[PDB]
Amino acid sequence: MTSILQIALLGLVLVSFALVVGVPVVFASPNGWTENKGVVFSGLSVWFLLVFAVGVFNSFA
Amino acid sequence: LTYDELQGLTYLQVKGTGIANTCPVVEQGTSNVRELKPGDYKLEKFCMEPTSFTVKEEDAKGREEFVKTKLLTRLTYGLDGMNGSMKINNDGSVEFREDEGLDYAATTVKLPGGEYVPFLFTIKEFDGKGTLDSFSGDFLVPSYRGSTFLDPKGRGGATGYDNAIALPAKADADEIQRLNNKSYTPGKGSAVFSVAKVDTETGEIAGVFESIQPSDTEMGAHPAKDIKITGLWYGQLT
Amino acid sequence: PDLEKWYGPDRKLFLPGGLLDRDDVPEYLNGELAGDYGYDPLGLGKDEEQVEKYRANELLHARWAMLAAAGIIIPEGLQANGADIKGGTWFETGAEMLNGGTLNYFAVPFGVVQNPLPLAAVTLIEIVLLGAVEKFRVDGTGPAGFSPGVGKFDSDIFDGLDKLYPGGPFDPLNLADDPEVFAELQVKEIKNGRLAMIAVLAFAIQSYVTGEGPYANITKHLSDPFGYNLLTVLQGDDRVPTL
Amino acid sequence: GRDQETTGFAWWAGNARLINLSGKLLGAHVAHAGLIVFWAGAMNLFEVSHFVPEKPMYEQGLILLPHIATLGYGVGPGGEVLDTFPYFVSGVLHLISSAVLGFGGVYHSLIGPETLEESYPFFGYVWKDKNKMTNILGYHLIILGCGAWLLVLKALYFGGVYDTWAPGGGDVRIISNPTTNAAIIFGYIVKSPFGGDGWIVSVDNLEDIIGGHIWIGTLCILGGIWHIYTTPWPWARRAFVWSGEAYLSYSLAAVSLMGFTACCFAWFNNTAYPSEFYGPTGPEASQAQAFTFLVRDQRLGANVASAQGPTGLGKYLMRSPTGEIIFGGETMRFWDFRGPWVEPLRGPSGLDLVKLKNDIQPWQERRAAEYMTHAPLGSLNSVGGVATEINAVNFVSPRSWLATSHFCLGFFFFVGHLWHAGRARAAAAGFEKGIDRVDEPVLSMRPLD
Amino acid sequence: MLTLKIFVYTVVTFFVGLFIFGFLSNDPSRNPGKG
Amino acid sequence: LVDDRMNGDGTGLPFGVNDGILGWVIAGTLGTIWAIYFVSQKDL
Amino acid sequence: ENTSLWARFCEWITSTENRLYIGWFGVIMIPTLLTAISVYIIAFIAAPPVDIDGIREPVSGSLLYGNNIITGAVVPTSNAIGLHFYPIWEAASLDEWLYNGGPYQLVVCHFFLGVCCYMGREWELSYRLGMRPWIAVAYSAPVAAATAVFIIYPIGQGSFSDGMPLGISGTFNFMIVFQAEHNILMHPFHMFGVAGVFGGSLFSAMHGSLVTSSLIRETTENESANAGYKFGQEEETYNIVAAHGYFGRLIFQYASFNNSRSLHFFLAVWPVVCIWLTALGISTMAFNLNGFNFNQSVVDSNGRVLNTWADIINRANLGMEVMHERNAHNFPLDLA
Ligand code: CLA
Numbered sequence A: 001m002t003s004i005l006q007i008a009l010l011g012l013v014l015v016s017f018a019l020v021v022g023v024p025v026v027f028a029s030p031n032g033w034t035e036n037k038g039v040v041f042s043g044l045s046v047w048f049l050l051v052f053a054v055g056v057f058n059s060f061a
Numbered sequence B: 001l002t003y004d005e006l007q008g009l010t011y012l013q014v015k016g017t018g019i020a021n022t023c024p025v026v027e028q029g030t031s032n033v034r035e036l037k038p039g040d041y042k043l044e045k046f047c048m049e050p051t052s053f054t055v056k057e058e059d060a061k062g063r064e065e066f067v068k069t070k071l072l073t074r075l076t077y078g079l080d081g082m083n084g085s086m087k088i089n090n091d092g093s094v095e096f097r098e099d100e101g102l103d104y105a106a107t108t109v110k111l112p113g114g115e116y117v118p119f120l121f122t123i124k125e126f127d128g129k130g131t132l133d134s135f136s137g138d139f140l141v142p143s144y145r146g147s148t149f150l151d152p153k154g155r156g157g158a159t160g161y162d163n164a165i166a167l168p169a170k171a172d173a174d175e176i177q178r179l180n181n182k183s184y185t186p187g188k189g190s191a192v193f194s195v196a197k198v199d200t201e202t203g204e205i206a207g208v209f210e211s212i213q214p215s216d217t218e219m220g221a222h223p224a225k226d227i228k229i230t231g232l233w234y235g236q237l238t
Numbered sequence C: 001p002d003l004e005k006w007y008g009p010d011r012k013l014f015l016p017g018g019l020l021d022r023d024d025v026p027e028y029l030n031g032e033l034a035g036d037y038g039y040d041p042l043g044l045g046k047d048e049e050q051v052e053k054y055r056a057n058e059l060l061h062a063r064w065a066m067l068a069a070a071g072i073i074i075p076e077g078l079q080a081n082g083a084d085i086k087g088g089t090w091f092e093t094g095a096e097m098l099n100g101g102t103l104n105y106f107a108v109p110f111g112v113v114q115n116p117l118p119l120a121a122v123t124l125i126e127i128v129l130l131g132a133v134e135k136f137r138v139d140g141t142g143p144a145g146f147s148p149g150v151g152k153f154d155s156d157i158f159d160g161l162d163k164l165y166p167g168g169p170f171d172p173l174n175l176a177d178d179p180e181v182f183a184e185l186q187v188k189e190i191k192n193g194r195l196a197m198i199a200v201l202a203f204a205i206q207s208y209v210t211g212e213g214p215y216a217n218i219t220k221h222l223s224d225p226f227g228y229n230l231l232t233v234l235q236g237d238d239r240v241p242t243l
Numbered sequence D: 001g002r003d004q005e006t007t008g009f010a011w012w013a014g015n016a017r018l019i020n021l022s023g024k025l026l027g028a029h030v031a032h033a034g035l036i037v038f039w040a041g042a043m044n045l046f047e048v049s050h051f052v053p054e055k056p057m058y059e060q061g062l063i064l065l066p067h068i069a070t071l072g073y074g075v076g077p078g079g080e081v082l083d084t085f086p087y088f089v090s091g092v093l094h095l096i097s098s099a100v101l102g103f104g105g106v107y108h109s110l111i112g113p114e115t116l117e118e119s120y121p122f123f124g125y126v127w128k129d130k131n132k133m134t135n136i137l138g139y140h141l142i143i144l145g146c147g148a149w150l151l152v153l154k155a156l157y158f159g160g161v162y163d164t165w166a167p168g169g170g171d172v173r174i175i176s177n178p179t180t181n182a183a184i185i186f187g188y189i190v191k192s193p194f195g196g197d198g199w200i201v202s203v204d205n206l207e208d209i210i211g212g213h214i215w216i217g218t219l220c221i222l223g224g225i226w227h228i229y230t231t232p233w234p235w236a237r238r239a240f241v242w243s244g245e246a247y248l249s250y251s252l253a254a255v256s257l258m259g260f261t262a263c264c265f266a267w268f269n270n271t272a273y274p275s276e277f278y279g280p281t282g283p284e285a286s287q288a289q290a291f292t293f294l295v296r297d298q299r300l301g302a303n304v305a306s307a308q309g310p311t312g313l314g315k316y317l318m319r320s321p322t323g324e325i326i327f328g329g330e331t332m333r334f335w336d337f338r339g340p341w342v343e344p345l346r347g348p349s350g351l352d353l354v355k356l357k358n359d360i361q362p363w364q365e366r367r368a369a370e371y372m373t374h375a376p377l378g379s380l381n382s383v384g385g386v387a388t389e390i391n392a393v394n395f396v397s398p399r400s401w402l403a404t405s406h407f408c409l410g411f412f413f414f415v416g417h418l419w420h421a422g423r424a425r426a427a428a429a430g431f432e433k434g435i436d437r438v439d440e441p442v443l444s445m446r447p448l449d
Numbered sequence E: 001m002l003t004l005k006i007f008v009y010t011v012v013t014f015f016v017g018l019f020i021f022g023f024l025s026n027d028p029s030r031n032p033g034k035g
Numbered sequence F: 001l002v003d004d005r006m007n008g009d010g011t012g013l014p015f016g017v018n019d020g021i022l023g024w025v026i027a028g029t030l031g032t033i034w035a036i037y038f039v040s041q042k043d044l
Numbered sequence G: 001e002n003t004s005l006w007a008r009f010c011e012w013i014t015s016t017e018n019r020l021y022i023g024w025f026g027v028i029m030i031p032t033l034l035t036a037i038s039v040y041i042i043a044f045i046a047a048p049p050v051d052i053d054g055i056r057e058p059v060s061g062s063l064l065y066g067n068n069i070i071t072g073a074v075v076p077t078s079n080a081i082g083l084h085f086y087p088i089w090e091a092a093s094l095d096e097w098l099y100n101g102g103p104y105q106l107v108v109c110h111f112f113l114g115v116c117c118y119m120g121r122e123w124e125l126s127y128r129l130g131m132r133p134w135i136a137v138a139y140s141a142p143v144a145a146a147t148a149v150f151i152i153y154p155i156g157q158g159s160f161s162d163g164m165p166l167g168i169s170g171t172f173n174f175m176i177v178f179q180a181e182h183n184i185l186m187h188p189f190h191m192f193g194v195a196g197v198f199g200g201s202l203f204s205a206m207h208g209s210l211v212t213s214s215l216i217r218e219t220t221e222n223e224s225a226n227a228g229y230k231f232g233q234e235e236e237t238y239n240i241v242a243a244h245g246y247f248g249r250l251i252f253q254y255a256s257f258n259n260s261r262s263l264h265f266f267l268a269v270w271p272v273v274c275i276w277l278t279a280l281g282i283s284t285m286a287f288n289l290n291g292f293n294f295n296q297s298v299v300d301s302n303g304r305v306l307n308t309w310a311d312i313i314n315r316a317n318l319g320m321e322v323m324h325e326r327n328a329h330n331f332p333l334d335l336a
């Protein structure tokens, strides 16, 4: 059950890397925030679910 | 201030107060003196405290007298924690032996005229033979500085140049006592003690003393001066 | 006052302005009901008929779950500090009177009286009482009166009343005649109800997970914050230290 | 953002452009808060990544783990590490909270509202609005009081804090009955900063620590309520400058004093900075040298009260300028030191002679030996010892690193306070740009200067 | 020495009080400019 | 003892006052300066 | 209407019309600096020997005690005192106070107060004159250095005996002992300080020679060139463009200072920031951070240690170590 924790954590790192690249360029693009709301919220929701998943799966690891 | 409540105060209650240089004073007890139980005694926690320092000063008109001096150092002169043994006889004949403990204190005083007089206020290796009212004797006085000390131009007994090397032509001249020979020979001091305010219940005594010792000689240099010291002393028995 | 923060076009939404432009709300939630945050990711509202029909069930769930939250947190705490309750914990209170073991009722401050009536009588009067009340609720028909707000009212008052908000007989203390304060209190009621619904569902899942009551949960958590939480309880037993 | 033609401030002063831009200002602040929380998480995880179970935390260049361990996490009797999971949890919570704060900072910096006045009057402010300036001050004072009370709660009911003064080498102890006496609390404040008193750096017991924290938390909450419910008095209005750069200058002078105080706390205090976790202080290492050279020469059959130095003073024991017995040598200058490894040997007369001869303890002797061998002496290469020593030991004390860095930061922040105090006064006066060239004040003054 | 200590103490608190109340006495109004 | 001193070092002595007349003259001098400052108000 | 005694005194203190501006910073500066000046002169002339090292080896320090201008110094406070705040009323006698280095502590405290209030008074005169306020920021560099050698190094080392002796040969002694313990030459902040004063002389001669190179003709060979400049004149007295073209075609045409404003900003900022860095060099070596340690850095394949220039520095450092405080040491490692 450790392998699922490393997969969840590395997925969290990839999500955070994409967020560091994407959230500023989505914010500062012309009229890009108005059309990328859904993808940014999707990234943040997956990020939060993976943080909670890693935290919970550490209690079983 | 007795020895009982001295132990009752912590470090921080005497820290910086000056109490730590004060010998205990037996408030209770009697002054009859003769009621001391004679016997083979090993006194422990001997305490010593000066109350005046005087220096013999030579005057042009020939008057030789002890002058009042200003203590240049702060409260670093009293002596505590000395040990030894003493005997008391039937008639009152007492001999005093002092062997180990903090029995010395480097002290510096100012003659009127601004002359620094360093002297090692010492009582080490004291043999006080006499009676209970008064008992006197000699005590060993180390010079001041040890041989490994070196003066501002190197030199000194154990470690140094043995020569004023700052000028390469004054190698052998009338400064013999300054560079050729360094003398640290330990001298002998004269002290007088007195006992008052004895306590036979807890085996503790008090009294005043009277010491006379020379100063530092600057390692075989300008003459020393005799230092008359007066104060109070405290001790306990066995 | 300040009813322009819960109704109208300018009202507190379920997301602030940066993450939710005001044009992103469903058109059928434009500030007409108490507790309208424009919260609808899944289209269950459709239009105003279905919204107020679902609000009926929301309000009944709220008015049940609030009393429920009080009824789960209070007697367990009373027993924990020392009342003679014997069954304050909610997921095992029903197990007390399985063998005739009737519960002890606390009429605080003058209580700890034994309830001398068994489970069969409890359930028979519980159905015949609340079934009568719920048949009254759908019909708006009530036999007798003597409410403190209006005394000894006859049955010709529940007709004409507003459904889900029947003032008068159900309003002994009034304090709702001003439509302004009535709207403010409607927002207060629905928000307290949603909070208590979240609280009681949290009570349920906390009980299923930790095997104990929520007052025990909050008490042990306040005693040891890091030593007693979700990540502590799912550990099972200790943790191999990393030294 | 903007350019120079619309702001008048160049890029090397570009943050000045957002003095009047409240939303971007708030975003820059919370993005910075994200940076602080990010460094705390990143460095904390880096430290637990570079942590060796055997060596103590001062040998390994650790500066955050000693803070957490002082709080009483993962340590037990004597200071050995029981687990690093509390440190890992602290680091991870800090990293994730920094991610959230950085999202907020990036949001208000890039697409957040320009000013918070026209729409959110609770948050939007002008710098000359003394009521709302005190309101924000009161909010932050309530937050500070809540943090101080969090430390009080941690010391009272949440495991206790680490005490180095408890017997047996010290341990994590629960604080019971903190000193709430106002005289004891404020006598530290009114105290002189010099030797023997040390101002507030000489707080030497956890009861005084937690009592002072009770006092600061309650006074901070009270001041928060007072500031939210009042407006500054006319004497304060006359005494002060009421621009944003002036408020910044006040904050800079305050945190500069705080940085200097933290320098002195790291260098001198050993109860808030336990020597097991942070290494020995300078005085501690000197007294440790004299102490272990006393006990070595005792075990080699020698007398300690005798054997004066080359100066006739006492190689092992002398008397302090007030009277009580102290360690001989140049370490006499550090006679003011008080540590848990000297107090069981120290009585009313200073160092007790019979206690120092007989009542030695093995853990005290080892602690003195290690506090010799790991003195706060080192280079910038992290080469231990004096500047003439070999390149063989890799050690510079965390006390040395903290004291040096925070003196540097305190000094520059005092200078920044000068810069902002002067510029805020000149901007309120109309001098920030130069002399007017036709209404020059010196030309209206008499000659002869 | 105690007399000297009381004298220096009253001198210092006098001059420091002068400094405190001089900077309380409306100091941002001493400028020679407009503002 | 050989000479008289204050021995005021250490002791956590507040404001360095060993006798109450020191605190009284500090408070009194600050008070006199405050008195002249206060009565010399409603000026400029 | 302005008749009250405090307001009249306030207008006297804050007045620009004084020959020397006093201000509210000057009402703290002037007594403190006068006290420090008085005690320093009196101590330099007639101070009896001072036990600096605490080992009963008093150092003379004063002219009447056989010193000259180069050798006389107000000797630092006793090492037995440490940092224990020794004023006159703490001492039993003036004799004891003079023995334990009291004048040094008096001068140091008053001088630190005096320089802090001097920097404040520079700000306050700039405020009452309608000036811009950062000359005090520029003066914060020598103030920082004075505090680093009179306050911070004694605080970090535990004893005011560690402070710089108020003298010339005492200053040299402070440097020799300092390099012995800390190896200041191998410190980047001190290297920055040396670069700062070398660049200060560089840019002082540079700017003075460029302004003097581009002086405008108003006078004759009879009259000194300064006689072409009139006090308070509106026209600029030299050709900035000519000097700038000179410097550009001298080193690099683009990499010159086209703004005289920016040029004078650079002149101000360079030695000020470098003296800031080297003052923190002293301040960080107070808490034993020291210079670089490059001893036995290079070794051969067979492990033998090659001597290096840093190792020659180390040899000189050992000579500076063992001889300094020759009698004050009782133990091998010099942690104190
Ligand atoms: C000092 C911090 C601070 C302040 C004063 C503000 C202020 C404001 N924000 Mg904001 N924000 C912040 C931080 C802050 N924010 C952070 C860190 C984030 C990232 C999560 C956001 C993300 C954010 C968004 C997406 C939006 C705002 C918006 C707004 C504006 C009004 C709506 C609102 O309340 O937002 C709501 C913010 C929250 C609901 C976050 C939860 C706050 C709760 C109360 C936490 C309780 C605090 C508690 C003490 C924890 C602190 C721990 C501490 C020790 C670190 C308002 C002026 C809106 C706006 O721009 O209007 C156009 C908007 O859309 N903010």
Ligand code: CLA
Residues within 6 Å of the ligand: A019, A020, A023, A024, A028, D001, D002, D003, D010, D011, D012, D013, D014, D015, D016, D017, D018, D021, D024, D025, D027, D028, D029, D031, D032, D099, D102, D103, D106, D108, D109, D110
């Ligand atoms: C603590 C450091 C810090 C912070 C927080 C800020 C913050 C800010 N600066 Mg600034 N600045 C700084 C340092 C800093 N600066 C320094 C050192 C300089 C000197 C070079 C400047 C010079 C400067 C100038 C000249 C200006 C600003 C301006 C601004 C504001 C708007 C910038 C903008 O939106 O343009 C757009 C910027 C971008 C599109 C690039 C940013 C992309 C992202 C945010 C970079 C970080 C990515 C990050 C990892 C993503 C995290 C996401 C999260 C989910 C984890 C803003 C609030 C402007 C201003 O004052 O407003 C009027 C302005 O003109 N600054």
Ligand code: CLA
Residues within 6 Å of the ligand: C225, D039, D063, D064, D067, D071, D147, D148, D150, D151, D153, D154, D158, D255, D256, D258, D259, D260, D262, D263, D265, D266, D402, D403, D406, D409, D410, D413
């Ligand atoms: C390059 C920038 C930089 C860096 C990397 C650091 C780094 C550091 N500084 Mg710092 N500082 C800086 C700049 C910097 N500083 C500047 C420019 C100044 C102004 C001159 C300061 C002034 C300063 C002071 C005054 C202090 C530090 C201190 C510290 C150290 C600990 C930080 C800390 O914990 O503070 C504290 C963190 C907070 C106050 C945020 C809130 C945290 C809450 C309140 C703690 C909750 C704990 C709670 C009890 C947990 C229990 C939970 C529950 C059960 C109750 C740390 C290594 C400290 C130190 O070690 O002294 C040497 C210290 O006292 N610094």
Ligand code: CLA
Residues within 6 Å of the ligand: D011, D012, D013, D014, D015, D016, D248, D252, D408, D409, D412, D413, D414, D415, D416, D417, D419, D423
């Ligand atoms: C939290 C404290 C703080 C805050 C909020 C501000 C805020 C501000 N300052 Mg400021 N300042 C401060 C402290 C602070 N300062 C300190 C401590 C100093 C040192 C004396 C200065 C000196 C200063 C000057 C000279 C100026 C400002 C200016 C400004 C304004 C524009 C800043 C800008 O964008 O420049 C841009 C930022 C950069 C170009 C980056 C600077 C890069 C530095 C040189 C690198 C240093 C990093 C290095 C690791 C430091 C190590 C030293 C030490 C830790 C060992 C702005 C409102 C300007 C102003 O007055 O506008 C009104 C301006 O002229 N400040």
Ligand SMILES: CCCCCCCCCCCCCCCCCC(=O)OC[C@H](CO)OC(=O)CCCCCCCCCCCCCCCCC
Residues within 6 Å of the ligand: D235, F015, F022, F023, F024, F026, F027, F028, F029, F030, F031, F032, F034, F035, F038, F041
């Ligand atoms: C060892 C003891 C010395 C310790 C020093 C600290 C003592 C406690 C003083 C703390 C008072 C906090 C002052 C904040 C407001 C000052 C601004 C002001 O001034 O604002 C000024 C403002 C202007 O209208 O007036 C006002 O707000 C009214 C001013 C309120 C200040 C009250 C002063 C208390 C009594 C003053 C001395 C008693 C006088 C006796 C001597 C007189 C001659 C014999």
Ligand SMILES: CC1=C(/C=C/C(C)=C/C=C/C(C)=C/C=C/C=C(C)/C=C/C=C(C)/C=C/C2=C(C)CCCC2(C)C)C(C)(C)CCC1
Residues within 6 Å of the ligand: A009, A012, A013, A016, A020, D031, D032, D034, D035, D038, D092, D095, D096, D098, D099, D100, D101, D102, D103, D105, D106, D109, D110
């Ligand atoms: C605006 C602006 C700017 C910026 C600012 C800032 C400051 C920002 C920020 C921000 C931030 C502040 C960020 C942060 C973040 C964070 C993150 C992104 C995170 C995360 C996470 C993760 C993913 C992790 C993981 C892990 C764990 C959990 C532990 C173990 C290990 C690991 C690591 C794996 C600048 C200056 C440029 C310019 C101007 C403008």
Ligand SMILES: CC1=C(/C=C/C(C)=C/C=C/C(C)=C/C=C/C=C(C)/C=C/C=C(C)/C=C/C2=C(C)CCCC2(C)C)C(C)(C)CCC1
Residues within 6 Å of the ligand: D184, D185, D186, D188, D189, D200, D203, D208, D209, D210, D211, D212, D213, D215, D216, D239, E019, E020, E021, E023, E024
């Ligand atoms: C926690 C703790 C504690 C406690 C503490 C406390 C309690 C603190 C506090 C405190 C306080 C309570 C403080 C206060 C302060 C203040 C200050 C420091 C200030 C200021 C300012 C100034 C300097 C002013 C100025 C001026 C004048 C003079 C007049 C005019 C105006 C002006 C502004 C210019 C203790 C130590 C016990 C222990 C440890 C821990």
Ligand SMILES: [Cl-]
Residues within 6 Å of the ligand: G173, G177, G323, G324, G325, G326
């Ligand atoms: Cl030397």
Ligand SMILES: [Cl-]
Residues within 6 Å of the ligand: D329, D330, D331, G328, G329, G330, G331, G333, G334, G336
């Ligand atoms: Cl030594």
Ligand SMILES: [Fe+2]
Residues within 6 Å of the ligand: G211
């Ligand atoms: Fe020029």
Ligand code: NA
Residues within 6 Å of the ligand: G322, G324, G325, G326, G327, G328, G329, G330
């Ligand atoms: Na030596």
